[PDB]
Enzyme design. Structure first.
Site, PDB file in Angstrom:
ATOM      1  N   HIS A 116       0.818  -1.209   0.000  1.00  0.00           N
ATOM      2  CA  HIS A 116       0.000   0.000   0.000  1.00  0.00           C
ATOM      3  C   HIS A 116       0.853   1.262   0.000  1.00  0.00           C
ATOM      4  O   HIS A 116       0.415   2.305  -0.500  1.00  0.00           O
ATOM      5  CB  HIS A 116      -0.946  -0.003   1.202  1.00  0.00           C
ATOM      6  CG  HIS A 116      -0.251   0.140   2.520  1.00  0.00           C
ATOM      7  ND1 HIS A 116       0.297  -0.931   3.193  1.00  0.00           N
ATOM      8  CD2 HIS A 116      -0.016   1.229   3.289  1.00  0.00           C
ATOM      9  CE1 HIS A 116       0.838  -0.508   4.321  1.00  0.00           C
ATOM     10  NE2 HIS A 116       0.661   0.798   4.405  1.00  0.00           N
ATOM     11  N   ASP A 158      -0.871  -7.758   1.316  1.00  0.00           N
ATOM     12  CA  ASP A 158      -0.455  -6.357   1.234  1.00  0.00           C
ATOM     13  C   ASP A 158       1.059  -6.246   1.408  1.00  0.00           C
ATOM     14  O   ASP A 158       1.556  -5.592   2.326  1.00  0.00           O
ATOM     15  CB  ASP A 158      -1.207  -5.508   2.268  1.00  0.00           C
ATOM     16  CG  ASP A 158      -0.823  -4.033   2.231  1.00  0.00           C
ATOM     17  OD1 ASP A 158      -1.244  -3.293   3.145  1.00  0.00           O
ATOM     18  OD2 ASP A 158      -0.120  -3.608   1.291  1.00  0.00           O
ATOM     19  N   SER A 182       4.538   2.423   8.330  1.00  0.00           N
ATOM     20  CA  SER A 182       4.293   1.083   7.815  1.00  0.00           C
ATOM     21  C   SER A 182       5.601   0.428   7.396  1.00  0.00           C
ATOM     22  O   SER A 182       6.519   1.088   6.903  1.00  0.00           O
ATOM     23  CB  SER A 182       3.327   1.134   6.632  1.00  0.00           C
ATOM     24  OG  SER A 182       1.987   1.227   7.078  1.00  0.00           O
TER      25      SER A 182
END
Lengths: 52, 153, 153, 153
Positions: free
Chosen positions: C30, C52, C104
């Protein structure tokens, strides 16, 4: 006949192109000093005229 | 000045000094080259030939760290990377011999760290050197002021 | 962590981290951006979209000096770039307020220097913040544990 | 040496060296790689393949400061990056274990800071290693000297 119609078509095309170029150049001339300066208190007549 | 005035690099030499003011980058048209910053290399430069400049929008990150515009210019001394510049009678001048080629685009700085003019060229009149520059106006007009005999650095 | 964890560039801004474990380099899908390391830019990444993530084979000169893996996960406090993370009830949580967008792919390290999980997002419960991450199992199964309301960082 | 000798980089690895002598940049054919310098990248390289070399005209801005050359070659020790090459019996030698791949194109300097020869490779003969180089001559000639069982670095 075809000659006169193509001549008229060319005339209207070059006229429209020249008018477009002239209004674009006028917009450049009357806008670029204000785009390089802060708080462009522009009378909106010029923009409203030449944006379209 | 040093932090937020990026030279223009080309063929291993610096040819000018592009400046960011009011959240927009400016770079003089008369000078050619590439900008060292990778961010500024991706900006679309709209060209104003009559004022010998091209301008573009800075990205989102770099808008906050920019030099401040100005309109009020009392005559007197003003800061400059090479020293001090005298402003008098609506004209910018410097001691003879200071500056030269490759210094175009250098902003003149005010006492409060505010930009007053951008250097485009200099004309040698014997005693001093008169600076061909671009200045602001009370009604937000960028007047391109060039004394006679101006030569673009 | 600092030496081996590489920032990712998105228009000149940090937006995530790519982590190398056991000779393979992983990056959340992402998060969009370019790896700062010039060499890693040439590494082909094959993508697990449902998880992901994208993982790729790393070069020969840096696979050995990698964050050593592990699978034993007793509940308690574990290391983290921003401090300590609490693993309880099979859930990773942090104090509410620390962490957010751009974190992230941050690895969670062990006391002995090994990796327990990689962060992907977080959801704020008001009292604490539960981190939606990927946690491994004794049987070598990587479960993407995402608490309800998880939003990727 | 350090100032005016530019490594050659390929895929993030240093594999060769290009040298400026007499206002001209020489590079060796066997090694392949770009030059980080803009100007040297912009130089037109004329290639002598049998000489295993390419020479190009150096720009004006750095022709004034360039390494000087010489043709007189008294036997003895000649300084260089990792020590001193011993010149005897019309041959250059270096103790076993010193040098290797990536050191090609490294100039051999004189006591007076003058280039005498350019190293292209070495050959292991057990007791020492004999350098395959490009020596010069008093009659305006350049002679490549190579031993038996040459391997170009």
């Amino acid at each position: 006949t075809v000659i006169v119609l193509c001549g008229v078509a060319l005339a209207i095309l070059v006229g429209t192109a020249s008018s477009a170029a002239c209004i674009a150049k006028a917009r450049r001339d009357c806008l670029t000093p204000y785009a390089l300066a802060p708080n462009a208190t522009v009378p909106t007549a010029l923009a409203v005229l030449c944006c379209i | 000045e040093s932090d937020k005035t990026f030279p223009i690099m080309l063929n291993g030499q610096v040819n000018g000094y592009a400046c960011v003011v009011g959240g927009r980058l400016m770079k003089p048209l008369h000078v050619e080259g590439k900008i060292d910053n990778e961010q500024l290399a991706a900006v679309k430069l709209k060209k104003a030939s009559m004022y010998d400049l091209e301008y573009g929008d800075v990205p989102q990150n770099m808008k906050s760290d920019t030099l401040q515009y100005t309109s009020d210019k009392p005559p007197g001394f003003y800061n400059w990377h090479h020293g001090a510049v005298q402003y008098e009678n609506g004209r910018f001048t410097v001691p003879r011999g200071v500056g030269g080629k490759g210094d175009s685009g250098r902003p003149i700085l005010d006492n409060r760290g505010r930009v007053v003019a951008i250097v485009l060229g200099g004309a040698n009149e014997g005693t001093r050197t008169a600076l061909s520059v671009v200045t602001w106006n009370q009604k937000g007009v960028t007047i391109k002021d060039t004394p006679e005999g101006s030569e673009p650095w």
